[PDB]
Amino acid sequence: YDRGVNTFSPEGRLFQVEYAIEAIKLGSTAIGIQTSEGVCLAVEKRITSPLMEPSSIEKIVEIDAHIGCAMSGLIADAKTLIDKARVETQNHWFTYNETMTVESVTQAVSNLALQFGEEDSRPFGVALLFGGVDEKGPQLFHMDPSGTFVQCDARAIGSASEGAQSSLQEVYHKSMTLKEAIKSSLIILKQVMEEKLNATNIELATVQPGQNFHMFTKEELEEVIKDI
Amino acid sequence: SYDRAITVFSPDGHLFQVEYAQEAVKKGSTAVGVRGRDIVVLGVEKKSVAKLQDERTVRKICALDDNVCMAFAGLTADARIVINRARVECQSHRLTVEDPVTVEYITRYIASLKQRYTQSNGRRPFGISALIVGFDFDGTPRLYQTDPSGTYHAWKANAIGRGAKSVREFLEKNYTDEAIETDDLTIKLVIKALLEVVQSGGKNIELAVMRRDQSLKILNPEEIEKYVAEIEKEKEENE
Amino acid sequence: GYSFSLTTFSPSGKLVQIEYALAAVAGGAPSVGIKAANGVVLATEKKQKSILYDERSVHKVEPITKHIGLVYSGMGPDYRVLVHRARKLAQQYYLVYQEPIPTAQLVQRVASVMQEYTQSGGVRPFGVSLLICGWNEGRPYLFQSDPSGAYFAWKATAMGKNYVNGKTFLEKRYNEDLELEDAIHTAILTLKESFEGQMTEDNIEVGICNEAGFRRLTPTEVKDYLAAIA
Amino acid sequence: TTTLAFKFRHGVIVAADSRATAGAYIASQTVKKVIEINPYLLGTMAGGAADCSFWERLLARQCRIYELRNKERISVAAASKLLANMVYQYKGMGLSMGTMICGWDKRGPGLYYVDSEGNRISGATFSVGSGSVYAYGVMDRGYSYDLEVEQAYDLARRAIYQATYRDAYSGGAVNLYHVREDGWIRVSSDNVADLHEKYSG
Amino acid sequence: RFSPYVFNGGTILAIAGEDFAIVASDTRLSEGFSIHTRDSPKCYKLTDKTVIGCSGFHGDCLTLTKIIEARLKMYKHSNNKAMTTGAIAAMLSTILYSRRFFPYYVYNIIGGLDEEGKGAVYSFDPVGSYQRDSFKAGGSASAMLQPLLDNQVGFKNMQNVEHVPLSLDRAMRLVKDVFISAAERDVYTGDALRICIVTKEGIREETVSLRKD
Amino acid sequence: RYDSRTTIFSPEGRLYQVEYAMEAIGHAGTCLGILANDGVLLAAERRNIHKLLDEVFFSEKIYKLNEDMACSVAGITSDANVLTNELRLIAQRYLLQYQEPIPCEQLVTALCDIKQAYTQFGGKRPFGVSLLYIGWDKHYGFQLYQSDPSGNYGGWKATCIGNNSAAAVSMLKQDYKEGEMTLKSALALAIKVLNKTMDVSKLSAEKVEIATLTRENGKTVIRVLKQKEVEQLIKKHEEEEAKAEREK
Amino acid sequence: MEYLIGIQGPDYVLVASDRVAASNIVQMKDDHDKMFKMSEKILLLCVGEAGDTVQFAEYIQKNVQLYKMRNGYELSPTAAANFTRRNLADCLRSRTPYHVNLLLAGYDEHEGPALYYMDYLAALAKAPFAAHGYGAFLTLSILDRYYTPTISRERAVELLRKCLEELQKRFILNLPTFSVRIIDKNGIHDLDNISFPKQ
Amino acid sequence: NQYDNDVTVWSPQGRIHQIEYAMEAVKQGSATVGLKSKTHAVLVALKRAQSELAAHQKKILHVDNHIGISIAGLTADARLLCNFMRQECLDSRFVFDRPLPVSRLVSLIGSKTQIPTQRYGRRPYGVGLLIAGYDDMGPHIFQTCPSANYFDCRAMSIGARSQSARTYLERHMSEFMECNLNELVKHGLRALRETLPAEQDLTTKNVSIGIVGKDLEFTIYDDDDVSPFLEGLEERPQ
Amino acid sequence: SIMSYNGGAVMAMKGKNCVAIAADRRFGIQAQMVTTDFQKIFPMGDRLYIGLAGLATDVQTVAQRLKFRLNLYELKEGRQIKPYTLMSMVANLLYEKRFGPYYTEPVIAGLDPKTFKPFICSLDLIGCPMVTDDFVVSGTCAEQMYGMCESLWEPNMDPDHLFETISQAMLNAVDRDAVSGMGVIVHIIEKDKITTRTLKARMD
């Protein structure tokens, strides 16, 4: 039937948004873990050429000085959602003198994740992970092209999604620490990627309560690899 | 096999009409470009003149601002609009903000213009792919490229056009970890790379350089003939 | 598969729907225009179905300005649209330039109106071709438009049913100069060429352009010409 | 109201008073007339209270988005230009705004002056306010480009004191900021009645 | 011809305590040389930790109060929490500036507790500039109240007087005495005195009569 | 198939509606222009010269457009009159703005941007019109240009477009002159080329048209020369043909 | 109020302005520049209101540069002058009129040098010399006295010095320094700054 | 099947199939149960987990101080009707300075969802609203449907396998008007446990309870205050 | 007034088979002159000119808008424009700015394009046309120009005495005006040729 978003199935359903979830599946993998000491985050780069400059490939962007991000799926759809999410926290600070909470960021983002045929275009092709430290401690969230917003404790999306999530439920518990969960993460990464893991295949991002700066690791990452 | 609309996802999640535009790039002329120590350079593969026309109207390399360059592929109808549009934006930026325009700002504009142009039906996407070169952002040489999907992206060396795959594999075995200084050496790299042309006539090359402080310098077919002579001369000594 | 829309081409040739609209012109009533040395004669064919129809209700020869007349062959209800368009467009010249619009100038503009209905994509073109006459600056004029938007200048022509007989007739039947009266005698003779019945003062309808202006004939005037018409 | 700003070898000095009146009635004595835009930009409040407060906050909303997109701080000449274009659209509608833009840049120190009329100019020394002309005399007599750091602190603190003495619409405390290459730093904030005993001896 | 403004009188007082805040106003509503009513308090309980006062043109005071209470609910269903005292003061400045070229003729003072449990007072102007103070007096009798509170609370122009912080019980009799002296010399003041006290246990109200002339 | 609107792309991948438009130019008339020092010319073919017509305009293919430029035309007449009314209105808009004539290239790019824009926005028919350009300016003198239904153009020294204009280019390269480019050498070349394309014997002067553009004392006159002086140009070519076979 | 001057030569154009940016009593800036390089052979001088000078003249500044990048060659000084007049006259009958006074200095390869005059009501004029401001009254009769159409560039700087010293004598405003350009077949050359030891 | 493409096209039997398909989208969501006494209207919903460690997606959501709604169906049309719902409530507070009557709020929803069921270019809203409220005449339980037929009811259960909850409510609807706040709640969550497969139990982490009362503002409980409600239950009769 | 902001004077006069038109040369703001070569007479085709006077902004603006509409007219029609047709064209252009009017008052002079027949007319600032048989004038110094032309005009005049009449009319009337002068240019056109002369006037 499908061929268009203005159409139902006899059973449910779409059949158009279902195909949008399929477009995530050929993206790169990405893992974020929520822990009481702070939210760590990891991703795989998949660099093609050595002539290809590596830092032009973004997977972690900085939404605000206490909220990180991680994406998969279509880059062309992603750059629009990153652009608004920076503005929405910025307007909220302009009219309230405060920082927008991590949950209410994604509410503003999901409000045009679902506008695709709801005017008076296609749905987007990108899934997102949002980590941040607001007044309720550290938070980690996840959305989809269907706008279904949810909270996750440790999520992994992109390709190797099911292969990560099965292994990731084995090691997670409530009383983790931040330095434990970083090396707990990239053990899963080298199991699910195809290349030998080095300092050029992956990158990290951690946010802490007292360390609103530096959602990043810059060649201290080389030290974490030999601590495997 | 529905390939007849741009707002439809495949059941394995594709946009084939975006994918079909990039096939139209591969019927375009090749163009390469590297960045150097101080002097950037790019070269094109110019097709044969048909003996009865003027050749100052077949312009394939243009400048947007006084310090940023441009090389494209695809089809010249869609290329002329994007050039004419981006000349306005790099000029209007200077009015609203008194700086010169960085090379990174103008590629985000071209990509975002090609971005929003993809999404609506009845707007056939731009089947071109651009190379943007400029040592403009405070003495720092950069080169980027675009894509008909609308994804700007940074390389250190590049090739487009018909059979760019041969050239890109050629550069990885040729672009040394030695950063090629002595900028005629860097020009000798590109002229040797374009000497592995689809035809390599020798008299069909137009190279354009920029020494990061001057304006654009189109080379002349006597100086470019000198560099082709020393490439064959130095290659004969290797035996 | 190309014969259902208008905004696309055929792989070899031209637009299909405009060619089908020209087939509607061929299935219309016959009409003759002859440019004489001093005037232009228009003539058409007006047969009603029954005896019941009044002949003095709807007219064919129709004035646009005091020196510009106009006939057709096609579909009558589409004709009334672009007549009323050509009326209002002729005044807009006169409001600007304070001068009666020359006959070359309307046909620039009326064809640009018939142009616009050949656009995309939910409108149909006209099914009417026209014959436009007028005596501007001494020399007369006789033009012909079409639903495509082209426009020409005939010495003499014919459109409607059985026009190819009337083309071959007037090809043999034209010279460079006759008077306005002898043009009328040969314009009724070519309408009689393809006719079914007794041609009376009500079966035909004739209008002329003198240099003294445009006028259409009364039935008494059209009787006396058809009386002793060869 | 009296503000002043000057740049020298070691950065930019910003100083202002703290009295806000309403006709002949003093509203407050503790008005912060130097608006802290960023950790690297400072703006003043001279002519109109809510007008200078709103549009500079809207400028601080704008420069943060520029930093997130381009991964680089905005230049001082750029932030002065963006404020000039926003105000010019409301020209003649009755805005009062006479602020100054201060900050370190890749070109070095930066000092621009912005009116509600559209007078975007650069310069070395400026003084804006009702008691501004009382400050141009005492500052220009003591100004040098090669002043010391502690000497320049005593110059600007003296110049506000002489302005609040003659003018009636200037008083309160004397704030003092110092723009360094890394960022601005608050120096001190002294009451005039304490400076009166120091300067008289 | 038609003029869109009129003056209604009123006097608003706020004092930021160490762990409290006191907002007081009279209840007289007047116009010209007439008394509309003797029962019209200017206090408004926004949240359990924030009370606002509104003076000036009364038709704008009714409008502006209803705009704020709508946007409190719009914050809460969008953010799952109530606004702070400082967030309301930041929001109100945008609302007042939004009609810059047809202004509200309203003087505003917001008193309430911060996130640390201390007093906070934000004064305003009709166009929307604000600052945090320790005490402000707004309205018609504002010039009769600021010089006295500088003496008692701020201890200005006093020699060899120690600075004990204002207790709650001492602050009550200061508020009750300044309005008695204000009702003698101002004509737009009298008939009652509504006092609101914001603590960490809720909001208490108290009414003290004044002279009725 | 891929028979829909101009959007979309084919796979492999190209644009069929543009190809159907550009190929359909071969069913049109015939127009050409030649190299010249101190001049430029155009030549064209009268089609459908049936004897019941008037030629009240005496200028059908050629449209003097600005003051020092004209153009030929080939394709659908319905789209032809739209562009010529547009293109004259472009040049006067430039002249209103600068008080200087339009310099003969950015006129062409202005039209080709319009002719392009119907290929991207749906759903419009692309213009099925190709046409030439002749003109003089301050910067390059005499020029030639070649419009396409795609919106692409090119500057030529001698070209031709129309009905049988695939073999006429071969005679132009066989009779390429350079340096020597006088008008009488150029007019004599043009009547020989139309003699190859048109299969009508003896080449009646009522079947052709020749328009020239020279430069005289700062005026840039434009000559659409009448049928009396075509006769001395035809019989000169008839004379040169009979003399050329005397060597056999 | 402030001052401009426009001496035209046989193959050069001599222009000069002042460097003052005063605010109602005080003189905030004494090295202000009023000279706008539109192109490599065209200058622009702008005198008017507080905001309309920078907003309008930069709109013309960036718009002529667009013509250069897009066509590949440069505007003539005649067409560049006559484009500016079109922009005031269109924006005159509106809620936002611009109140500036201009004069244009250009050199052509085909027409030689050129000087144009512009009012705030957008009237063009082709003049052999021009001036603006209140100092235009005292000085242009001196320049009318000693002008020769066949004058050398050394006499023109000397005639400029005569033209400025009487403005130092009988004009109430201060005006100490005066920046000077010159335009010839090569391009815009900057001459030395003109200042005044008064007493 | 050729009539089964648009909302505009009638069938040759008179049944528009696109409205019939949006009814099936309501059965994709979980079950939820609403009921009322003379004084208290209680709606109880069932959460569903996405993964083992993700949070459970919420169902009951606050609208006004006297109205709260439940949800079933697409989350796109959930927040889309919610933002229309909250806007109309504060307008009556702003204009009339009274709370809305609950009955005439729902008539605005039926006028809202009617237009995308007739004009072309917009799908119907696949959604399953259950509404509890207090006007001046006591509690109310309303349900809607994507066919815009809103029903007044005294007990209702919609969602996946929600028929087994309805059969429980029919043989206990006489008991509902008289009981207090306490067992009225656990009359209601005895109905949800028949919409469960018999191997798992109604725990704390998967259920929400919202109560609006005659003197009680609409309050949502979750995961900690459910334990005073889950006490005093029997096991499943297996 | 706004008409008295820059001054100006335009005069046309009909002869036997010829027609003459004249104007001043001074450009200046209210009391200060600027230049003495300001064009106020513009050619519109052959043997047909136009003169403009009033606000110097609208003099240059209307002359460019009218040239815009003329060249589009002479390309849709192969013929040139008739003098009556131009008068109807100008009056349309002025009346469109009915409430925002251009501050100018045109004067049209020319011959017939086919015959030899002269034509003169003038318009108001909102477009009321007015054809005469002897002379039309416009500008600030209107009343001085009426006093000279009522006495010096003769019905049938050769191009010699037509030149001397309009010369003596313009020299004596403008010297009585304050804001007009600094030279007078005269166009005298006829069927065979066009003569342009400039007169020796007072430069004070």
mmCIF file of C-alpha atoms in Angstrom, chain B residues 54-168:
data_model
loop_
_atom_site.group_PDB
_atom_site.id
_atom_site.type_symbol
_atom_site.label_atom_id
_atom_site.label_comp_id
_atom_site.label_asym_id
_atom_site.label_seq_id
_atom_site.Cartn_x
_atom_site.Cartn_y
_atom_site.Cartn_z
ATOM 1 C CA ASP B 54 35.848 31.169 -28.653
ATOM 2 C CA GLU B 55 37.181 29.499 -25.529
ATOM 3 C CA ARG B 56 36.886 32.238 -22.915
ATOM 4 C CA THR B 57 33.281 31.161 -22.280
ATOM 5 C CA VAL B 58 33.986 27.557 -21.241
ATOM 6 C CA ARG B 59 35.091 28.641 -17.770
ATOM 7 C CA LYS B 60 35.265 25.749 -15.292
ATOM 8 C CA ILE B 61 37.253 27.356 -12.462
ATOM 9 C CA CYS B 62 35.875 30.479 -10.851
ATOM 10 C CA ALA B 63 36.485 32.602 -7.785
ATOM 11 C CA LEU B 64 33.751 33.501 -5.346
ATOM 12 C CA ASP B 65 35.655 36.064 -3.290
ATOM 13 C CA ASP B 66 39.121 37.512 -3.819
ATOM 14 C CA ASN B 67 40.665 34.663 -1.818
ATOM 15 C CA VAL B 68 38.576 31.527 -2.468
ATOM 16 C CA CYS B 69 38.385 29.346 -5.576
ATOM 17 C CA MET B 70 35.994 26.823 -7.064
ATOM 18 C CA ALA B 71 36.071 23.763 -9.312
ATOM 19 C CA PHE B 72 33.078 21.615 -10.199
ATOM 20 C CA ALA B 73 31.780 18.702 -12.243
ATOM 21 C CA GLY B 74 28.368 17.632 -13.455
ATOM 22 C CA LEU B 75 26.402 19.851 -15.814
ATOM 23 C CA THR B 76 27.008 23.529 -16.462
ATOM 24 C CA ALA B 77 23.385 24.633 -16.183
ATOM 25 C CA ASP B 78 23.114 23.790 -12.495
ATOM 26 C CA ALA B 79 26.707 24.868 -11.905
ATOM 27 C CA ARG B 80 26.142 28.439 -13.084
ATOM 28 C CA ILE B 81 23.337 29.080 -10.597
ATOM 29 C CA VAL B 82 25.306 27.853 -7.597
ATOM 30 C CA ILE B 83 28.298 29.985 -8.572
ATOM 31 C CA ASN B 84 26.124 33.060 -9.103
ATOM 32 C CA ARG B 85 24.347 32.464 -5.806
ATOM 33 C CA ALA B 86 27.499 31.922 -3.767
ATOM 34 C CA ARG B 87 29.053 35.122 -5.094
ATOM 35 C CA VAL B 88 26.173 36.978 -3.459
ATOM 36 C CA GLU B 89 26.439 35.216 -0.112
ATOM 37 C CA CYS B 90 30.181 35.746 0.271
ATOM 38 C CA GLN B 91 29.506 39.376 -0.556
ATOM 39 C CA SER B 92 26.480 39.827 1.699
ATOM 40 C CA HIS B 93 28.331 38.196 4.595
ATOM 41 C CA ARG B 94 31.001 40.881 4.321
ATOM 42 C CA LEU B 95 28.316 43.564 4.592
ATOM 43 C CA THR B 96 26.596 42.099 7.652
ATOM 44 C CA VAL B 97 29.884 41.122 9.330
ATOM 45 C CA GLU B 98 32.935 43.153 8.356
ATOM 46 C CA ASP B 99 35.349 40.210 8.115
ATOM 47 C CA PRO B 100 36.354 38.468 4.915
ATOM 48 C CA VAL B 101 34.506 35.215 4.396
ATOM 49 C CA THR B 102 36.210 32.071 5.639
ATOM 50 C CA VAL B 103 36.416 29.050 3.371
ATOM 51 C CA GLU B 104 34.388 27.015 5.865
ATOM 52 C CA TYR B 105 31.471 29.439 5.940
ATOM 53 C CA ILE B 106 30.888 29.470 2.202
ATOM 54 C CA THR B 107 30.810 25.679 1.890
ATOM 55 C CA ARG B 108 28.154 25.427 4.563
ATOM 56 C CA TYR B 109 26.064 27.840 2.510
ATOM 57 C CA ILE B 110 26.409 25.861 -0.717
ATOM 58 C CA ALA B 111 25.687 22.590 1.065
ATOM 59 C CA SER B 112 22.686 24.027 2.901
ATOM 60 C CA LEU B 113 21.414 25.488 -0.354
ATOM 61 C CA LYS B 114 21.666 22.073 -1.937
ATOM 62 C CA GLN B 115 20.183 20.600 1.256
ATOM 63 C CA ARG B 116 16.791 22.335 1.368
ATOM 64 C CA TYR B 117 16.558 21.991 -2.403
ATOM 65 C CA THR B 118 16.442 18.200 -2.125
ATOM 66 C CA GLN B 119 13.474 17.858 0.193
ATOM 67 C CA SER B 120 10.511 19.177 -1.805
ATOM 68 C CA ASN B 121 8.912 17.505 -4.809
ATOM 69 C CA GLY B 122 9.165 19.375 -8.065
ATOM 70 C CA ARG B 123 12.723 20.505 -7.269
ATOM 71 C CA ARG B 124 15.185 18.368 -9.212
ATOM 72 C CA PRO B 125 18.448 18.271 -7.225
ATOM 73 C CA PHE B 126 21.696 19.854 -8.351
ATOM 74 C CA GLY B 127 23.766 17.258 -10.148
ATOM 75 C CA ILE B 128 27.136 18.893 -9.498
ATOM 76 C CA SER B 129 29.974 18.357 -7.051
ATOM 77 C CA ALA B 130 32.208 21.238 -6.084
ATOM 78 C CA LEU B 131 35.755 21.703 -4.839
ATOM 79 C CA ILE B 132 36.355 24.778 -2.718
ATOM 80 C CA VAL B 133 39.958 25.846 -2.181
ATOM 81 C CA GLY B 134 41.186 28.867 -0.278
ATOM 82 C CA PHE B 135 44.103 29.891 1.936
ATOM 83 C CA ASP B 136 41.884 32.586 3.350
ATOM 84 C CA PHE B 137 41.176 31.901 7.021
ATOM 85 C CA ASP B 138 44.231 33.710 8.437
ATOM 86 C CA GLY B 139 47.046 32.091 6.477
ATOM 87 C CA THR B 140 45.671 28.559 6.832
ATOM 88 C CA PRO B 141 45.302 26.620 3.553
ATOM 89 C CA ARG B 142 42.146 24.515 3.318
ATOM 90 C CA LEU B 143 40.218 22.598 0.704
ATOM 91 C CA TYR B 144 36.769 21.042 1.017
ATOM 92 C CA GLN B 145 34.310 19.374 -1.307
ATOM 93 C CA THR B 146 30.562 19.083 -1.676
ATOM 94 C CA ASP B 147 28.204 16.342 -2.801
ATOM 95 C CA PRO B 148 24.749 16.340 -4.439
ATOM 96 C CA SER B 149 23.252 15.012 -1.209
ATOM 97 C CA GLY B 150 24.431 18.251 0.375
ATOM 98 C CA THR B 151 27.294 17.088 2.590
ATOM 99 C CA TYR B 152 30.308 19.366 2.786
ATOM 100 C CA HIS B 153 33.448 17.540 3.738
ATOM 101 C CA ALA B 154 37.166 18.198 4.175
ATOM 102 C CA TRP B 155 39.985 16.380 2.405
ATOM 103 C CA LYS B 156 43.687 16.986 1.939
ATOM 104 C CA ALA B 157 43.704 15.861 -1.712
ATOM 105 C CA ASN B 158 40.816 15.266 -4.058
ATOM 106 C CA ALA B 159 39.645 14.006 -7.433
ATOM 107 C CA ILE B 160 36.245 14.089 -9.150
ATOM 108 C CA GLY B 161 34.916 13.502 -12.651
ATOM 109 C CA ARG B 162 35.118 10.465 -14.893
ATOM 110 C CA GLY B 163 37.473 7.868 -13.464
ATOM 111 C CA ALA B 164 38.412 9.760 -10.331
ATOM 112 C CA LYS B 165 38.846 6.381 -8.630
ATOM 113 C CA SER B 166 42.058 5.837 -10.579
ATOM 114 C CA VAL B 167 43.348 9.226 -9.460
ATOM 115 C CA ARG B 168 42.361 8.831 -5.805
#
